[PDB]
Design a protein around this nucleic acid. Structure first.
Lengths: 108, 95, 87, 99, 100, 83, 108, 96
DNA sequence: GCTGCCGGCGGCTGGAGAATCCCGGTGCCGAGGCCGCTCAATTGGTCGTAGACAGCTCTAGCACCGCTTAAACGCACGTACGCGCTGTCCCCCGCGTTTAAACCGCCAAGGGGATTACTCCCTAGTCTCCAGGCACGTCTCAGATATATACATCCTG
DNA sequence: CAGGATGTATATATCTGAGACGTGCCTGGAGACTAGGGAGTAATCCCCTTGGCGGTTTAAACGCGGGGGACAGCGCGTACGTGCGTTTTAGCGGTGCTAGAGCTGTCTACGACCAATTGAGCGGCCTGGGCACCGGGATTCTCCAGCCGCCGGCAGC
């Protein structure tokens, strides 16, 4: 007995079993290997941790405690590498990045 | 009834592992749920096509690796592979 | 008198100050007077394109209600995916 | 006597004000009426959920803001300050939407 | 008598007429192949290139440049000029969504 | 005269012919470097994916199907070399 | 008993068997119906016939007897609807449609 | 003299002879036709399978193909294709 | 007034350099007959998705009115628009000539592709029990409001 | 070219209370424990097609030199889009109200799967000859620069 979760052995916080079930029932391939769910879970964890840490820093800069879509937008749009990945997507209640053309500004 | 799956708990844990003193709103959590759901398919479809491309039949870490190399732009992918390898090199050592 | 209350000329409901606010958010300084119809036309055609797919999704589903899922679904089909509505 | 600002001063203030807020800019009821008017021609006697209504509103909002950005760029290219429909149909055709 | 020299801007229209019916490539094959081989060195050393792939890449890059130049000409004409400048190229790549 | 970088291999008359096929009438004196840069960038952005595809299959040659597949990934399909 | 092809019974010039086998081996779904291959073959036959006729008209126009990629490009780009269908496809040896801006023309 | 391949050459040529009984086709154009047919088939099949899974079903039927066609071909092609497909499938089921 | 007088004005003439047509010889390569094999058509039984009926019931469109806030109308006016003159110098466009790509042929060999014996990894099957979704249940500290001061304009001298 | 007055912004005080964060329950699906047999894996060999070489030659690139007209700058008329006051009109809301359409559960039956035989559709490999290629030469086809008759100002009276 003494069952152990695969995530605990892999040292991850994501449902390896859930990802493995999704791979089987997604009709992606006839047969599925073993390390693929672990790799995919690790990649997802890395991306989500990076995004969430950036959003948290952005929210802290605004002197707020919680996270709102405005902070998510302000964190995503300020990273060009992340901008390339999320170029063709839009988030609800995000607003726009404040920018003003220099010509329209007064003379001095 | 009719339980619906979600990624709320694990996203909350990941948030706690980086910021132990910051909360999250309602919509700000569904946004991250949708982002994860999008990326999952965006990687799995590419991996599936790549496996079919060589007339293979099983998905292994190698095609997922190539998918990560193609999708994530540059330096980010440069990091990801390492952790990915890390994430498996322990698991095979102790199943 | 149960249903089929066909209305007309509701495109004019998009008032001028709303367009002024949208343009100010865009970041323009001066606004002409001839754009008030071109914007109303491009918005209308965009709505037709979205609603066609939105409706045919339900038609395939053989239902009589249009949910949010279908709207997001058709927006993703034409490469305009949208986060924050349970994709 | 009474204080009148130089022309174009209030435009700059509205620019830096609205660029910060995040709420919608179009009233919900006229938009719903327009959506209901359009939906009839495809299949009559339908039924709408709200979440679809504000989803459509947000999508149209984003599209219009994106179009206005390129319109401003084309206008400022031509050594002008206002915007004309010609910039709009230039931007819509360079993108390839109307090509 | 004086030698017959054409008025400015006519031979250009003649080439415009001639080239728009042609289908062949307009870039020398050997320099392009050498450029491709040189630029592929960084990713991996000692690679072999099949013949068909080089011409495929060639005509793909020909079509891309043709489209970009057409859009640039349209943008330049929009500005009540007849000459094209690098800023028109930059603005076109701004609007189409490639540089940013 | 043999030391010539392959990027210089794109001669100016070739650029002129490409522009004429595009439909332009007059050309200034600075397009010839912007075009060279754009060409190089677009070349790398496809050769990277193609070469990666070669690496995955353990081969050592860049076959036609590989290059057309990578072009299809970028959003520019190709007809004629198979598919 | 004597055998006969499915296309003969459906009056088609496209192979039902090959398309059905492709539907099986294409990973697309777990099970496939019966009318789906016939429907898909009919649609493909329609599209191919229309393209072939449109190319043949242009081929006969320039006093030729065999079709050339240039003729295919000319037929595709001259029909706006089919142009929308094939908006981003590039055809090898297709050249470009002849067109000249009005301003670039002389005064008269 | 081995590893036989597959293509759509014969059917395309057969259709050609039923439209222009005096016209031929070069090799490059024929390959272009083959590639276009493959691309369209892949697109339609992918859309149909996606829709079949979207409603959590498990079988692909004629209805899925019809909706996929309606979702891709703009206008005239859509109705012409659905009409010809319907008449063809009715012909098939009527004559077993 | 009216003589030249002068420069343009468009209208026409004809030379000039380019693009087009057809004829006549020559190939290279789609189009068709041939052989066979390999997969598609014929039979045959099953058992489990999918169609029906038969229910329950959450919720979306109607209506009703009180408030009120932003939408519609007009109104001085200055500023950014559009046109017109203009001074070049920088691209267009032939010419000599200098050069590298294109053709053509002969080689070597490393890597791509077909064949084969096999092994051990993931699927097929059961039993089991604990992580996660649902229903609450709150008190939070998250916001929401109201208040009070510095600030950057546009005028003045 | 330096101050004053201003309507804006900024900060800071109270509420204040819908809903992030636990807190339990229970369930169904994820982990523990059994072969097997077929999918990939080395190992082999056998072509082949690609990198490489070395003479011509000949059409394309290159640097020069001459020239004219598109372009950025400057200036002026002007008219219409902006800041502001005065209605008023439809949005927001808050309250019920109702049946319609959306959700789930049972039962049955039929059609897609899979396995075993048998024959013909098509993929390969020559093979003859026919439509596109190429050349020169006659045939038109626009492009241009100057000549000429006319015309409207321009010095005088």
């Amino acid at each position: 007995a003494k069952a152990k979760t695969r995530s605990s052995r892999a040292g991850l916080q994501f449902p390896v079993g859930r990802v493995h079930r999704l791979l089987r029932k997604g009709n992606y391939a006839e047969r599925v290997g073993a390390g693929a769910p672990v790799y995919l879970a690790a990649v997802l964890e890395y991306l989500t941790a990076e995004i969430l840490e950036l959003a948290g820093n952005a929210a802290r800069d605004n002197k707020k405690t919680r996270i709102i879509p405005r902070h998510l937008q302000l964190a995503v749009r300020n990273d060009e590498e992340l901008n390339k990945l999320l170029g063709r997507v839009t988030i609800a209640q995000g607003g726009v990045l404040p920018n003003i053309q220099s010509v329209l500004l007064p003379k001095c | 009834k009719t339980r619906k799956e979600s990624y709320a708990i694990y996203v909350y844990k990941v948030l706690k592992q980086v910021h132990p003193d910051t909360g999250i709103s309602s919509k700000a959590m569904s946004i991250m749920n949708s982002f994860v759901n999008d990326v999952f398919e965006r990687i799995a479809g590419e991996a599936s096509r790549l496996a079919h491309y060589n007339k293979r039949s099983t998905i292994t870490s190698r095609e997922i690796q190539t998918a990560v190399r193609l999708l994530l732009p540059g330096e980010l992918a440069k990091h990801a592979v390492s952790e990915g390898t890390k994430a498996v090199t322990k698991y095979t050592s102790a199943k | 008198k149960r249903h089929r209350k066909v209305l007309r000329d509701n495109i004019q409901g998009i008032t001028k100050p709303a367009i002024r606010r949208l343009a100010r958010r865009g970041g323009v300084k001066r606004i002409s007077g001839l754009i008030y119809e071109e914007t109303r036309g491009v918005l209308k055609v965009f709505l037709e394109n979205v609603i066609r797919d939105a409706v045919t999704y339900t038609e395939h589903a053989k239902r009589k209600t249009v949910t949010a899922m279908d709207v997001v679904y058709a927006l993703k089909r034409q490469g305009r995916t949208l986060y924050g509505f349970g994709g | 006597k009474p204080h009148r600002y130089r022309p174009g001063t209030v435009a700059l203030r509205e620019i830096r004000r609205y660029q910060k807020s995040t709420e919608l800019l179009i009233r919900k009821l006229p938009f719903q009426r327009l959506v209901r008017e359009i939906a009839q021609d495809f299949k009559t006697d339908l039924r709408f959920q709200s979440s679809a209504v504000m989803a459509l509103q947000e999508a149209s909002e984003a599209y219009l803001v994106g179009l206005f950005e390129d319109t401003n760029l084309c206008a400022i290219h031509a050594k002008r300050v206002t915007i004309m429909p010609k910039d709009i149909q230039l931007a819509r055709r360079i993108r390839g939407e109307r090509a």
